[PDB]
Amino acid sequence: ENPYERGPDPTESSIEAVRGPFAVAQTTVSRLQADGFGGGTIYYPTDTSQGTFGAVAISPGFTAGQESIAWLGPRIASQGFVVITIDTITRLDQPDSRGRQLQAALDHLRTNSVVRNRIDPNRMAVMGHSMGGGGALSAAANNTSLEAAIPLQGWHTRKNWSSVRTPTLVVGAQLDTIAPVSSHSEAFYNSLPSDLDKAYMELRGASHFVSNTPDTTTAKYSIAWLKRFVDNDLRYEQFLCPAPDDFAISEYRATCPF
Amino acid sequence: ENPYERGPDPTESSIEAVRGPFAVAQTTVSRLQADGFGGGTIYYPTDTSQGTFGAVAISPGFTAGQESIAWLGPRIASQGFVVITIDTITRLDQPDSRGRQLQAALDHLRTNSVVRNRIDPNRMAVMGHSMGGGGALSAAANNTSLEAAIPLQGWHTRKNWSSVRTPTLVVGAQLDTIAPVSSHSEAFYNSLPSDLDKAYMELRGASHFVSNTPDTTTAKYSIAWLKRFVDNDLRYEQFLCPAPDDFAISEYRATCPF
């Protein structure tokens, strides 16, 4: 029996829902309380009766604040995760620094009074938009114990991710002109190791900013990826393997079965 | 230019070599000659043309002698370091006492006629196996001027190392049942300050005693860590950031960029 399974068996409706089965609360980490990042908001399930949850840190991109990624916080946490949306030390920080800050935010959770007993500190994951997605890849490259990484329209000068050992879902936007998929997202996917459990999902017709307001395709597959790899939850593989038949997806690759 | 750089530009071959680019000589410190430790062997480079070298002290574990870590002495010294492998005052000394003895051995070097003019006493580091690695962590916490610390399969009853200010590489052995990584090595790493330059390297399939005979993965990354932090040698950051791909490493984390 998988001890990390949380919540009832999933369906298309359950993974598409704006709020999953877990009621959520939130707490604020001030810039002064944040060591190594710019503060953030932690969203967590209030129901502790099924045990501890994996933890996820999410970074915004260049010039952006938590508000550009905030919707992901409670939408993911309500599926059974402790999720921190961060602000960066400055909004001009580059991807490598964003990766250091994502790790600092995860480590903050280990001692945070509100959530220390709610997380399984051994099961953590990273996500981010654009430079924040470059930061998520950097954080995985620097920490092979992370269970999942999800760069959303990621931007980074670093194109070679052969060092990553963390299952990674790369989400590109077809019409992205800021972090074009050919030179960013797809290049990242192609340099991740052949053997790694990974996937590439390109969002049809989407601009670079698709992640900055609610997008059901982004949410449902991020949830499935986090469930499958943070929780080792085999109930969620069905949404990723084989490729889903989804008009919202213009290209797809995945190393199924995982 | 960094005045502390020593030796040719590094490669995987050079950091993996049993003997690096510097020829070495040795001198013995008798138990009677040793103030605050049980004696030792000092290995040092004979090439003085680049100036003085940083110094490193290495402690064995409980019940063990210098011979259980001796191979590390000339292997590290041949990369450009003055390295003393110690015996402890008694074989039953506990971790904090081993830390005091590591510092005493380092402080000995400035009084030793053979090597006193070969060292930079402002650039020193500590290492040790099991209780000796607990001693290295203690010595680091108790001397914020130390430049690097490397506990190898460290054992300590103290799990909270939040006061350490010295860049630390924690080397775990995946299958260790004596100082299991979950309750020793990883607990130490997780409690080191988030802001500290630090790394955790887990040796795949390794037992507690992997450090007691030559292990190339242990040597190469210890050398890279000492270079990066004792010498501030940026030529060695490439081996530590991002996670190396070695098969012999089952897990790696580091607070890159340093």
Side-chain angles (χ1 to χ4, degrees), chain B residues 159-195:
Chain B
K159 311 304 182 173
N160 188 347
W161 293 100
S162 61
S163 79
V164 173
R165 311 299 177 229
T166 290
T168 296
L169 166 64
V170 179
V171 184
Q174 184 177 37
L175 305 183
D176 200 327
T177 67
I178 293 167
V181 298
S182 68
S183 52
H184 293 263
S185 282
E186 286 169 347
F188 310 148
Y189 182 77
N190 289 334
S191 70
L192 288 169
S194 175
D195 64 27

PDB file of all heavy atoms in Angstrom, chain B residues 159-195:
ATOM      1  N   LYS B 159      22.316  16.735  16.654  1.00  0.00           N
ATOM      2  CA  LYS B 159      21.791  16.764  15.291  1.00  0.00           C
ATOM      3  C   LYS B 159      21.646  18.170  14.730  1.00  0.00           C
ATOM      4  O   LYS B 159      21.585  18.329  13.505  1.00  0.00           O
ATOM      5  CB  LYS B 159      20.412  16.090  15.237  1.00  0.00           C
ATOM      6  CG  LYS B 159      20.379  14.740  15.910  1.00  0.00           C
ATOM      7  CD  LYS B 159      21.422  13.779  15.328  1.00  0.00           C
ATOM      8  CE  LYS B 159      21.324  12.417  15.993  1.00  0.00           C
ATOM      9  NZ  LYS B 159      22.208  11.404  15.358  1.00  0.00           N
ATOM     10  N   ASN B 160      21.614  19.178  15.591  1.00  0.00           N
ATOM     11  CA  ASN B 160      21.401  20.570  15.219  1.00  0.00           C
ATOM     12  C   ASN B 160      22.739  21.276  15.091  1.00  0.00           C
ATOM     13  O   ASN B 160      23.450  21.473  16.083  1.00  0.00           O
ATOM     14  CB  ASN B 160      20.545  21.255  16.285  1.00  0.00           C
ATOM     15  CG  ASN B 160      20.122  22.653  15.882  1.00  0.00           C
ATOM     16  OD1 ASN B 160      20.641  23.218  14.923  1.00  0.00           O
ATOM     17  ND2 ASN B 160      19.163  23.217  16.613  1.00  0.00           N
ATOM     18  N   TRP B 161      23.062  21.682  13.870  1.00  0.00           N
ATOM     19  CA  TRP B 161      24.319  22.334  13.538  1.00  0.00           C
ATOM     20  C   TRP B 161      24.082  23.736  12.992  1.00  0.00           C
ATOM     21  O   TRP B 161      24.823  24.215  12.141  1.00  0.00           O
ATOM     22  CB  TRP B 161      25.142  21.452  12.595  1.00  0.00           C
ATOM     23  CG  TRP B 161      25.553  20.213  13.346  1.00  0.00           C
ATOM     24  CD1 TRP B 161      24.980  18.977  13.281  1.00  0.00           C
ATOM     25  CD2 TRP B 161      26.597  20.121  14.329  1.00  0.00           C
ATOM     26  NE1 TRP B 161      25.604  18.120  14.156  1.00  0.00           N
ATOM     27  CE2 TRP B 161      26.609  18.794  14.801  1.00  0.00           C
ATOM     28  CE3 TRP B 161      27.540  21.027  14.834  1.00  0.00           C
ATOM     29  CZ2 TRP B 161      27.516  18.348  15.766  1.00  0.00           C
ATOM     30  CZ3 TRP B 161      28.436  20.583  15.791  1.00  0.00           C
ATOM     31  CH2 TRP B 161      28.415  19.254  16.249  1.00  0.00           C
ATOM     32  N   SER B 162      23.036  24.402  13.495  1.00  0.00           N
ATOM     33  CA  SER B 162      22.653  25.717  12.999  1.00  0.00           C
ATOM     34  C   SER B 162      23.689  26.804  13.264  1.00  0.00           C
ATOM     35  O   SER B 162      23.591  27.875  12.660  1.00  0.00           O
ATOM     36  CB  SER B 162      21.295  26.123  13.582  1.00  0.00           C
ATOM     37  OG  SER B 162      21.348  26.194  14.995  1.00  0.00           O
ATOM     38  N   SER B 163      24.646  26.585  14.169  1.00  0.00           N
ATOM     39  CA  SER B 163      25.680  27.574  14.444  1.00  0.00           C
ATOM     40  C   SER B 163      26.903  27.471  13.535  1.00  0.00           C
ATOM     41  O   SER B 163      27.788  28.322  13.630  1.00  0.00           O
ATOM     42  CB  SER B 163      26.043  27.623  15.934  1.00  0.00           C
ATOM     43  OG  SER B 163      26.906  26.574  16.281  1.00  0.00           O
ATOM     44  N   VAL B 164      26.973  26.461  12.655  1.00  0.00           N
ATOM     45  CA  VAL B 164      28.139  26.312  11.786  1.00  0.00           C
ATOM     46  C   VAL B 164      28.143  27.421  10.742  1.00  0.00           C
ATOM     47  O   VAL B 164      27.136  27.657  10.058  1.00  0.00           O
ATOM     48  CB  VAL B 164      28.128  24.924  11.132  1.00  0.00           C
ATOM     49  CG1 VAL B 164      29.237  24.807  10.086  1.00  0.00           C
ATOM     50  CG2 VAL B 164      28.311  23.858  12.196  1.00  0.00           C
ATOM     51  N   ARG B 165      29.298  28.078  10.588  1.00  0.00           N
ATOM     52  CA  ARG B 165      29.513  29.144   9.609  1.00  0.00           C
ATOM     53  C   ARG B 165      30.589  28.771   8.598  1.00  0.00           C
ATOM     54  O   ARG B 165      30.993  29.614   7.782  1.00  0.00           O
ATOM     55  CB  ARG B 165      29.904  30.459  10.302  1.00  0.00           C
ATOM     56  CG  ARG B 165      29.020  30.896  11.469  1.00  0.00           C
ATOM     57  CD  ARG B 165      27.576  31.144  11.070  1.00  0.00           C
ATOM     58  NE  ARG B 165      26.791  31.494  12.255  1.00  0.00           N
ATOM     59  CZ  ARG B 165      25.626  30.945  12.577  1.00  0.00           C
ATOM     60  NH1 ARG B 165      25.106  30.005  11.802  1.00  0.00           N
ATOM     61  NH2 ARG B 165      24.989  31.326  13.680  1.00  0.00           N
ATOM     62  N   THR B 166      31.054  27.549   8.630  1.00  0.00           N
ATOM     63  CA  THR B 166      32.143  27.087   7.774  1.00  0.00           C
ATOM     64  C   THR B 166      31.577  26.231   6.656  1.00  0.00           C
ATOM     65  O   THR B 166      30.814  25.303   6.931  1.00  0.00           O
ATOM     66  CB  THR B 166      33.097  26.249   8.613  1.00  0.00           C
ATOM     67  OG1 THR B 166      33.793  27.124   9.517  1.00  0.00           O
ATOM     68  CG2 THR B 166      34.132  25.547   7.727  1.00  0.00           C
ATOM     69  N   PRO B 167      31.908  26.517   5.401  1.00  0.00           N
ATOM     70  CA  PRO B 167      31.388  25.711   4.286  1.00  0.00           C
ATOM     71  C   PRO B 167      31.646  24.227   4.504  1.00  0.00           C
ATOM     72  O   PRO B 167      32.789  23.802   4.676  1.00  0.00           O
ATOM     73  CB  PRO B 167      32.189  26.241   3.095  1.00  0.00           C
ATOM     74  CG  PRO B 167      32.349  27.712   3.414  1.00  0.00           C
ATOM     75  CD  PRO B 167      32.683  27.678   4.919  1.00  0.00           C
ATOM     76  N   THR B 168      30.583  23.424   4.443  1.00  0.00           N
ATOM     77  CA  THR B 168      30.648  22.029   4.873  1.00  0.00           C
ATOM     78  C   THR B 168      30.135  21.098   3.785  1.00  0.00           C
ATOM     79  O   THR B 168      29.022  21.289   3.280  1.00  0.00           O
ATOM     80  CB  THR B 168      29.810  21.833   6.158  1.00  0.00           C
ATOM     81  OG1 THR B 168      30.385  22.594   7.217  1.00  0.00           O
ATOM     82  CG2 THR B 168      29.794  20.374   6.594  1.00  0.00           C
ATOM     83  N   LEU B 169      30.923  20.062   3.484  1.00  0.00           N
ATOM     84  CA  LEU B 169      30.531  18.966   2.605  1.00  0.00           C
ATOM     85  C   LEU B 169      30.278  17.768   3.513  1.00  0.00           C
ATOM     86  O   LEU B 169      31.199  17.261   4.165  1.00  0.00           O
ATOM     87  CB  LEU B 169      31.651  18.658   1.609  1.00  0.00           C
ATOM     88  CG  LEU B 169      31.504  17.324   0.865  1.00  0.00           C
ATOM     89  CD1 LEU B 169      30.257  17.321  -0.027  1.00  0.00           C
ATOM     90  CD2 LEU B 169      32.742  17.063   0.020  1.00  0.00           C
ATOM     91  N   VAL B 170      29.026  17.325   3.559  1.00  0.00           N
ATOM     92  CA  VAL B 170      28.611  16.162   4.339  1.00  0.00           C
ATOM     93  C   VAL B 170      28.609  14.962   3.402  1.00  0.00           C
ATOM     94  O   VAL B 170      27.855  14.943   2.419  1.00  0.00           O
ATOM     95  CB  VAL B 170      27.210  16.378   4.935  1.00  0.00           C
ATOM     96  CG1 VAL B 170      26.759  15.151   5.737  1.00  0.00           C
ATOM     97  CG2 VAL B 170      27.164  17.644   5.787  1.00  0.00           C
ATOM     98  N   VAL B 171      29.439  13.957   3.679  1.00  0.00           N
ATOM     99  CA  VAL B 171      29.506  12.760   2.837  1.00  0.00           C
ATOM    100  C   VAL B 171      28.822  11.609   3.569  1.00  0.00           C
ATOM    101  O   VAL B 171      29.288  11.161   4.626  1.00  0.00           O
ATOM    102  CB  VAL B 171      30.940  12.391   2.425  1.00  0.00           C
ATOM    103  CG1 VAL B 171      30.925  11.190   1.477  1.00  0.00           C
ATOM    104  CG2 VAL B 171      31.628  13.581   1.803  1.00  0.00           C
ATOM    105  N   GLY B 172      27.717  11.113   3.010  1.00  0.00           N
ATOM    106  CA  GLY B 172      27.010   9.990   3.588  1.00  0.00           C
ATOM    107  C   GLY B 172      27.280   8.717   2.821  1.00  0.00           C
ATOM    108  O   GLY B 172      27.676   8.742   1.671  1.00  0.00           O
ATOM    109  N   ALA B 173      27.047   7.589   3.479  1.00  0.00           N
ATOM    110  CA  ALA B 173      27.091   6.281   2.828  1.00  0.00           C
ATOM    111  C   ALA B 173      25.672   5.730   2.793  1.00  0.00           C
ATOM    112  O   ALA B 173      25.052   5.548   3.842  1.00  0.00           O
ATOM    113  CB  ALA B 173      28.010   5.331   3.593  1.00  0.00           C
ATOM    114  N   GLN B 174      25.165   5.469   1.584  1.00  0.00           N
ATOM    115  CA  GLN B 174      23.748   5.137   1.415  1.00  0.00           C
ATOM    116  C   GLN B 174      23.266   4.044   2.366  1.00  0.00           C
ATOM    117  O   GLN B 174      22.186   4.160   2.957  1.00  0.00           O
ATOM    118  CB  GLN B 174      23.482   4.732  -0.028  1.00  0.00           C
ATOM    119  CG  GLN B 174      22.009   4.462  -0.306  1.00  0.00           C
ATOM    120  CD  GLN B 174      21.767   4.133  -1.761  1.00  0.00           C
ATOM    121  OE1 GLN B 174      22.573   3.462  -2.406  1.00  0.00           O
ATOM    122  NE2 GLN B 174      20.640   4.608  -2.292  1.00  0.00           N
ATOM    123  N   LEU B 175      24.034   2.961   2.493  1.00  0.00           N
ATOM    124  CA  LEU B 175      23.613   1.783   3.248  1.00  0.00           C
ATOM    125  C   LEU B 175      24.187   1.739   4.660  1.00  0.00           C
ATOM    126  O   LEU B 175      24.175   0.684   5.300  1.00  0.00           O
ATOM    127  CB  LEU B 175      23.935   0.502   2.472  1.00  0.00           C
ATOM    128  CG  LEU B 175      23.342   0.452   1.056  1.00  0.00           C
ATOM    129  CD1 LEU B 175      23.641  -0.891   0.387  1.00  0.00           C
ATOM    130  CD2 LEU B 175      21.849   0.723   1.079  1.00  0.00           C
ATOM    131  N   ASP B 176      24.645   2.877   5.175  1.00  0.00           N
ATOM    132  CA  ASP B 176      25.209   2.947   6.522  1.00  0.00           C
ATOM    133  C   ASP B 176      24.166   2.571   7.569  1.00  0.00           C
ATOM    134  O   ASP B 176      23.097   3.180   7.636  1.00  0.00           O
ATOM    135  CB  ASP B 176      25.685   4.390   6.748  1.00  0.00           C
ATOM    136  CG  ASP B 176      26.701   4.515   7.865  1.00  0.00           C
ATOM    137  OD1 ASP B 176      26.612   3.745   8.844  1.00  0.00           O
ATOM    138  OD2 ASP B 176      27.575   5.421   7.789  1.00  0.00           O
ATOM    139  N   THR B 177      24.487   1.575   8.398  1.00  0.00           N
ATOM    140  CA  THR B 177      23.628   1.201   9.519  1.00  0.00           C
ATOM    141  C   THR B 177      24.183   1.639  10.863  1.00  0.00           C
ATOM    142  O   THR B 177      23.518   1.451  11.892  1.00  0.00           O
ATOM    143  CB  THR B 177      23.400  -0.316   9.545  1.00  0.00           C
ATOM    144  OG1 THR B 177      24.637  -0.972   9.848  1.00  0.00           O
ATOM    145  CG2 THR B 177      22.857  -0.800   8.201  1.00  0.00           C
ATOM    146  N   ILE B 178      25.387   2.198  10.882  1.00  0.00           N
ATOM    147  CA  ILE B 178      26.032   2.634  12.118  1.00  0.00           C
ATOM    148  C   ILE B 178      25.788   4.114  12.367  1.00  0.00           C
ATOM    149  O   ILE B 178      25.466   4.531  13.482  1.00  0.00           O
ATOM    150  CB  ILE B 178      27.537   2.318  12.047  1.00  0.00           C
ATOM    151  CG1 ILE B 178      27.748   0.798  12.050  1.00  0.00           C
ATOM    152  CG2 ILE B 178      28.265   2.971  13.214  1.00  0.00           C
ATOM    153  CD1 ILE B 178      29.149   0.393  11.679  1.00  0.00           C
ATOM    154  N   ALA B 179      25.963   4.931  11.328  1.00  0.00           N
ATOM    155  CA  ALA B 179      25.609   6.348  11.356  1.00  0.00           C
ATOM    156  C   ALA B 179      24.666   6.556  10.179  1.00  0.00           C
ATOM    157  O   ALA B 179      25.027   7.178   9.165  1.00  0.00           O
ATOM    158  CB  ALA B 179      26.830   7.260  11.245  1.00  0.00           C
ATOM    159  N   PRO B 180      23.463   5.988  10.251  1.00  0.00           N
ATOM    160  CA  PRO B 180      22.565   6.040   9.096  1.00  0.00           C
ATOM    161  C   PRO B 180      22.356   7.472   8.633  1.00  0.00           C
ATOM    162  O   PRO B 180      22.256   8.403   9.433  1.00  0.00           O
ATOM    163  CB  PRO B 180      21.269   5.418   9.627  1.00  0.00           C
ATOM    164  CG  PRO B 180      21.721   4.569  10.763  1.00  0.00           C
ATOM    165  CD  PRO B 180      22.820   5.347  11.411  1.00  0.00           C
ATOM    166  N   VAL B 181      22.289   7.642   7.313  1.00  0.00           N
ATOM    167  CA  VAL B 181      22.215   8.998   6.777  1.00  0.00           C
ATOM    168  C   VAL B 181      20.953   9.718   7.237  1.00  0.00           C
ATOM    169  O   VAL B 181      20.977  10.933   7.474  1.00  0.00           O
ATOM    170  CB  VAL B 181      22.401   9.031   5.246  1.00  0.00           C
ATOM    171  CG1 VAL B 181      23.765   8.498   4.863  1.00  0.00           C
ATOM    172  CG2 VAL B 181      21.300   8.253   4.542  1.00  0.00           C
ATOM    173  N   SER B 182      19.843   8.996   7.412  1.00  0.00           N
ATOM    174  CA  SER B 182      18.609   9.687   7.775  1.00  0.00           C
ATOM    175  C   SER B 182      18.714  10.366   9.142  1.00  0.00           C
ATOM    176  O   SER B 182      18.157  11.451   9.343  1.00  0.00           O
ATOM    177  CB  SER B 182      17.411   8.736   7.690  1.00  0.00           C
ATOM    178  OG  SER B 182      17.492   7.749   8.698  1.00  0.00           O
ATOM    179  N   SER B 183      19.424   9.751  10.097  1.00  0.00           N
ATOM    180  CA  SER B 183      19.487  10.272  11.456  1.00  0.00           C
ATOM    181  C   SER B 183      20.815  10.949  11.789  1.00  0.00           C
ATOM    182  O   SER B 183      20.916  11.575  12.845  1.00  0.00           O
ATOM    183  CB  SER B 183      19.192   9.169  12.485  1.00  0.00           C
ATOM    184  OG  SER B 183      20.010   8.042  12.261  1.00  0.00           O
ATOM    185  N   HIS B 184      21.833  10.801  10.930  1.00  0.00           N
ATOM    186  CA  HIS B 184      23.128  11.450  11.128  1.00  0.00           C
ATOM    187  C   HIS B 184      23.374  12.393   9.983  1.00  0.00           C
ATOM    188  O   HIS B 184      22.854  13.524   9.978  1.00  0.00           O
ATOM    189  CB  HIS B 184      24.237  10.413  11.384  1.00  0.00           C
ATOM    190  CG  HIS B 184      24.096   9.683  12.680  1.00  0.00           C
ATOM    191  ND1 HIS B 184      24.782  10.050  13.821  1.00  0.00           N
ATOM    192  CD2 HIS B 184      23.313   8.633  13.028  1.00  0.00           C
ATOM    193  CE1 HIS B 184      24.453   9.234  14.806  1.00  0.00           C
ATOM    194  NE2 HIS B 184      23.561   8.369  14.354  1.00  0.00           N
ATOM    195  N   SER B 185      24.114  11.981   8.943  1.00  0.00           N
ATOM    196  CA  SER B 185      24.527  12.869   7.854  1.00  0.00           C
ATOM    197  C   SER B 185      23.440  13.828   7.377  1.00  0.00           C
ATOM    198  O   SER B 185      23.665  15.039   7.315  1.00  0.00           O
ATOM    199  CB  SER B 185      25.006  12.049   6.660  1.00  0.00           C
ATOM    200  OG  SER B 185      26.320  11.542   6.846  1.00  0.00           O
ATOM    201  N   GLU B 186      22.274  13.303   6.968  1.00  0.00           N
ATOM    202  CA  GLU B 186      21.256  14.188   6.404  1.00  0.00           C
ATOM    203  C   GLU B 186      20.660  15.097   7.462  1.00  0.00           C
ATOM    204  O   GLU B 186      20.335  16.253   7.173  1.00  0.00           O
ATOM    205  CB  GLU B 186      20.179  13.391   5.665  1.00  0.00           C
ATOM    206  CG  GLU B 186      20.643  12.841   4.314  1.00  0.00           C
ATOM    207  CD  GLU B 186      19.681  11.829   3.714  1.00  0.00           C
ATOM    208  OE1 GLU B 186      18.771  11.357   4.433  1.00  0.00           O
ATOM    209  OE2 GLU B 186      19.856  11.474   2.532  1.00  0.00           O
ATOM    210  N   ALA B 187      20.515  14.604   8.686  1.00  0.00           N
ATOM    211  CA  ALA B 187      20.052  15.467   9.766  1.00  0.00           C
ATOM    212  C   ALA B 187      21.020  16.623   9.972  1.00  0.00           C
ATOM    213  O   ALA B 187      20.602  17.772  10.142  1.00  0.00           O
ATOM    214  CB  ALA B 187      19.895  14.658  11.053  1.00  0.00           C
ATOM    215  N   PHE B 188      22.330  16.347   9.937  1.00  0.00           N
ATOM    216  CA  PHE B 188      23.307  17.428  10.056  1.00  0.00           C
ATOM    217  C   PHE B 188      23.143  18.420   8.910  1.00  0.00           C
ATOM    218  O   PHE B 188      23.075  19.634   9.128  1.00  0.00           O
ATOM    219  CB  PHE B 188      24.747  16.891  10.032  1.00  0.00           C
ATOM    220  CG  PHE B 188      25.028  15.740  10.979  1.00  0.00           C
ATOM    221  CD1 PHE B 188      25.970  14.781  10.615  1.00  0.00           C
ATOM    222  CD2 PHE B 188      24.369  15.596  12.180  1.00  0.00           C
ATOM    223  CE1 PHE B 188      26.252  13.701  11.440  1.00  0.00           C
ATOM    224  CE2 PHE B 188      24.658  14.526  13.021  1.00  0.00           C
ATOM    225  CZ  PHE B 188      25.596  13.573  12.644  1.00  0.00           C
ATOM    226  N   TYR B 189      23.097  17.915   7.671  1.00  0.00           N
ATOM    227  CA  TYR B 189      23.005  18.795   6.509  1.00  0.00           C
ATOM    228  C   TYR B 189      21.776  19.693   6.583  1.00  0.00           C
ATOM    229  O   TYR B 189      21.852  20.892   6.289  1.00  0.00           O
ATOM    230  CB  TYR B 189      22.956  17.959   5.229  1.00  0.00           C
ATOM    231  CG  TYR B 189      22.907  18.811   3.995  1.00  0.00           C
ATOM    232  CD1 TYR B 189      24.044  19.432   3.506  1.00  0.00           C
ATOM    233  CD2 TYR B 189      21.689  19.059   3.348  1.00  0.00           C
ATOM    234  CE1 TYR B 189      23.992  20.235   2.384  1.00  0.00           C
ATOM    235  CE2 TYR B 189      21.625  19.878   2.225  1.00  0.00           C
ATOM    236  CZ  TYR B 189      22.781  20.461   1.748  1.00  0.00           C
ATOM    237  OH  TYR B 189      22.767  21.276   0.630  1.00  0.00           O
ATOM    238  N   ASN B 190      20.629  19.119   6.952  1.00  0.00           N
ATOM    239  CA  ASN B 190      19.375  19.863   6.981  1.00  0.00           C
ATOM    240  C   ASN B 190      19.355  20.931   8.059  1.00  0.00           C
ATOM    241  O   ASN B 190      18.577  21.880   7.942  1.00  0.00           O
ATOM    242  CB  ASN B 190      18.190  18.910   7.173  1.00  0.00           C
ATOM    243  CG  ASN B 190      17.906  18.045   5.948  1.00  0.00           C
ATOM    244  OD1 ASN B 190      18.218  18.412   4.808  1.00  0.00           O
ATOM    245  ND2 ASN B 190      17.296  16.886   6.180  1.00  0.00           N
ATOM    246  N   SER B 191      20.154  20.788   9.118  1.00  0.00           N
ATOM    247  CA  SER B 191      20.164  21.775  10.186  1.00  0.00           C
ATOM    248  C   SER B 191      21.255  22.828  10.029  1.00  0.00           C
ATOM    249  O   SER B 191      21.230  23.836  10.739  1.00  0.00           O
ATOM    250  CB  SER B 191      20.284  21.106  11.559  1.00  0.00           C
ATOM    251  OG  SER B 191      21.577  20.549  11.736  1.00  0.00           O
ATOM    252  N   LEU B 192      22.225  22.612   9.142  1.00  0.00           N
ATOM    253  CA  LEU B 192      23.163  23.671   8.799  1.00  0.00           C
ATOM    254  C   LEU B 192      22.386  24.873   8.262  1.00  0.00           C
ATOM    255  O   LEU B 192      21.333  24.712   7.641  1.00  0.00           O
ATOM    256  CB  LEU B 192      24.117  23.173   7.714  1.00  0.00           C
ATOM    257  CG  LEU B 192      25.152  22.142   8.153  1.00  0.00           C
ATOM    258  CD1 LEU B 192      25.832  21.554   6.923  1.00  0.00           C
ATOM    259  CD2 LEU B 192      26.182  22.728   9.097  1.00  0.00           C
ATOM    260  N   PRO B 193      22.882  26.090   8.475  1.00  0.00           N
ATOM    261  CA  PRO B 193      22.134  27.274   8.026  1.00  0.00           C
ATOM    262  C   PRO B 193      21.797  27.187   6.545  1.00  0.00           C
ATOM    263  O   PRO B 193      22.602  26.729   5.732  1.00  0.00           O
ATOM    264  CB  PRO B 193      23.113  28.422   8.286  1.00  0.00           C
ATOM    265  CG  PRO B 193      23.938  27.947   9.446  1.00  0.00           C
ATOM    266  CD  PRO B 193      24.124  26.455   9.178  1.00  0.00           C
ATOM    267  N   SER B 194      20.588  27.639   6.196  1.00  0.00           N
ATOM    268  CA  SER B 194      20.185  27.677   4.794  1.00  0.00           C
ATOM    269  C   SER B 194      21.166  28.500   3.967  1.00  0.00           C
ATOM    270  O   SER B 194      21.468  28.150   2.820  1.00  0.00           O
ATOM    271  CB  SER B 194      18.757  28.225   4.680  1.00  0.00           C
ATOM    272  OG  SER B 194      18.402  28.380   3.327  1.00  0.00           O
ATOM    273  N   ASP B 195      21.677  29.597   4.535  1.00  0.00           N
ATOM    274  CA  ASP B 195      22.543  30.516   3.806  1.00  0.00           C
ATOM    275  C   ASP B 195      23.985  30.036   3.662  1.00  0.00           C
ATOM    276  O   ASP B 195      24.745  30.645   2.908  1.00  0.00           O
ATOM    277  CB  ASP B 195      22.453  31.949   4.359  1.00  0.00           C
ATOM    278  CG  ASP B 195      22.959  32.081   5.790  1.00  0.00           C
ATOM    279  OD1 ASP B 195      23.814  31.280   6.222  1.00  0.00           O
ATOM    280  OD2 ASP B 195      22.506  33.018   6.486  1.00  0.00           O
TER     281      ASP B 195
END
